[PDB]
Design a protein around this ligand. Structure first.
Ligand SMILES: Nc1ncnc2c1ncn2[C@@H]1O[C@H](COP(=O)(O)OP(=O)(O)OP(=O)(O)O)[C@@H](O)[C@H]1O
Lengths: 384, 51, 54
């Protein structure tokens, strides 16, 4: 009855809505019959067919423009008929008239296979408190990322500029990855996510055009939150050394300083950076006011890991047998990705049985496998 | 007769202006199709009554 | 898993509306460049289109 109640309202409304729009398709055209109907006829004859794609290099303010077509021949076309010159400006793809080339309008625009990596197709299904615990170093990421979008009111009282940027840093597995995708579900504004391993390329010059782009798209479709996941990856990853190397790393860094900030006066591009090599960055990067409140994470304490382990064991089958608190005893200042791997490994023991139950025995066994990982790339035994 | 009037009618049919192979990049909902011609560039162009 | 399983199918059936709606909304859609003052620009730029200087 608790699922159904939700369903009963929401389905019937999507079925009606759909039906409504079928009867309605015809109905759109009815309030006119010469008031707009006629207008449509006039535009069309002008346009004819085919409308030839050009690329607009530059405009001239005498009602003309110079197009360079991808078919070769440049043409000195006229901006005439059904066109604003405020929807023209470098980079446009235009509709040309198939006798004398006049720009009848601009409708065509074409997305890049690099704005496809940047732009996301999801809204995160997981939300906040899936690594929860350390939930006071999370109001340094929701009073400066979430909140000046949500309230202008608070920062109007105090006046001045409102927050800008965060650098998340700490141990690996201590939630950094999920922090960024958990604030993007709540805000619901354009979430860009780029890996830093794609900012390092094996070809020069294109490196800077990529980094210069991310904030330009970002400011355009503002508000935006740009997650740069891993900016520790800029000095450890590098291909060849003769189109890689120092030169390529230095230039992408230089570019990124203009974007944030710089002179651009672009859109809203809150920044979220995850790192753990924070001293392989510039002093004009970890500069204040492109970092505001910075967040340090260390390994959780014993009573924190009890918050963490009860999030993770709610999704699992339980018994009265299971005891969380002795799993906590064993681990001592370890990541919550360690604790997340024991619960993921505990169902691997269930899967291995082909028994649908999860027991105290399944959680303790996978705790031994998790502790095998830690101390066996070790070979000292006892600290030599 | 079927034979000889199949030859005479194929002389008409073989005569073309050139009829190409295109691929659809994307549609636009003004009732037109953005077609990239496989050698050439892109042209937004109207469609027939069979499609 | 009876109590949940029923809802799960009913959710799939629901999704089928959302696709259909994207196609009906897009069947009758219009698009513009520049609207109302450039209806006027058609009167003028059609006299000038007949000539050759483009
Ligand atoms: N507090 C927690 N509650 C629930 N899951 C957690 C918690 N902390 C971390 N996790 C989980 O551990 C996995 C990895 O964590 P996440 O990527 O969010 O962060 P991180 O500290 O950058 O670590 P890494 O980058 O090495 O994965 C994810 O599935 C994440 O949800």
């Amino acid at each position: 009855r608790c699922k159904l109640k939700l369903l009963r309202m929401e389905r019937i409304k999507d079925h009606l809505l759909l039906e409504e729009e079928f009867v309605s398709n015809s109905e759109i055209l009815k309030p006119f019959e010469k008031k707009q109907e006629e207008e449509k006829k006039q535009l069309e004859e002008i346009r004819g067919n085919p409308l030839s794609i050009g690329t607009l290099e530059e405009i001239i303010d005498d009602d003309h423009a110079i197009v360079t077509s991808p078919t070769m021949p440049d043409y000195y076309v006229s901006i005439l008929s059904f066109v604003d010159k405020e929807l023209l400006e470098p980079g446009c793809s235009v509709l040309l008239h198939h006798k004398t080339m006049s720009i009848v309008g601009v409708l065509q625009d074409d997305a890049d296979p690099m704005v496809s990596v940047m732009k996301m197709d999801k809204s995160p299904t997981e939300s906040y408190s899936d690594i929860g615990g350390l939930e006071s170093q999370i109001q340094e990421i929701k009073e400066s990322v979430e909140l000046p979008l949500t309230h202008p009111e608070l920062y109007e009282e105090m006046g001045i500029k409102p927050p800008k940027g965060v650098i998340l840093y700490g141990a690996p597995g201590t939630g950094k990855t999920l922090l960024a995708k958990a604030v993007a579900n709540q805000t619901s504004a354009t979430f860009l996510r780029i890996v830093g391993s794609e900012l390092i390329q094996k070809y020069l010059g294109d490196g800077p055009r990529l980094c210069r782009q991310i904030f330009k798209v970002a400011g355009e479709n503002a508000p935006s939150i740009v997650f740069i996941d891993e900016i520790d990856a800029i000095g450890t990853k590098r291909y060849d050394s003769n189109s890689g190397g120092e030169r390529e790393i230095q230039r992408t860094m230089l570019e990124l300083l203009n974007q944030l900030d710089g002179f651009d006066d672009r859109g809203d591009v809150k920044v979220i950076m995850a790192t753990n090599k924070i001293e392989t960055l510039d002093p004009a990067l970890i500069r204040p006011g492109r970092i505001d409140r910075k967040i340090l994470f260390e390994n959780p304490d014993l009573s924190t890991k009890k918050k963490i382990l009860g999030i993770h064991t709610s999704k699992m089958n339980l018994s009265e047998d299971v005891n969380l608190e002795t799993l906590v005893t064993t681990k001592d200042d370890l990541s919550g990705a360690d604790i997340q791997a024991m619960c993921t490994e505990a169902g691997l023991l269930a899967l291995r049985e082909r028994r649908m139950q999860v027991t105290a025995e399944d959680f303790k066994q996978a705790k031994e496998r998790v502790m095998k990982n830690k101390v066996e790339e070790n070979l000292e035994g006892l600290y030599l | 007769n079927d034979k000889v009037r199949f030859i005479k009618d194929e002389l008409r049919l073989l005569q073309e202006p050139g009829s190409y192979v295109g691929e659809v990049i994307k549609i636009v909902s003004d009732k037109k199709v953005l077609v990239k011609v496989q050698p050439e560039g892109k042209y937004i162009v109207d469609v027939a009554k069979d499609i | 898993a009876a109590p949940y399983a029923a809802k799960l199918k009913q959710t799939e059936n629901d999704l089928k509306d959302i696709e259909a709606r994207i196609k009906e909304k897009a069947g009758v859609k219009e698009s513009d460049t520049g609207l109302a003052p450039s209806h006027l620009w058609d009167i003028m730029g059609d006299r000038q289109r007949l000539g050759e200087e483009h």
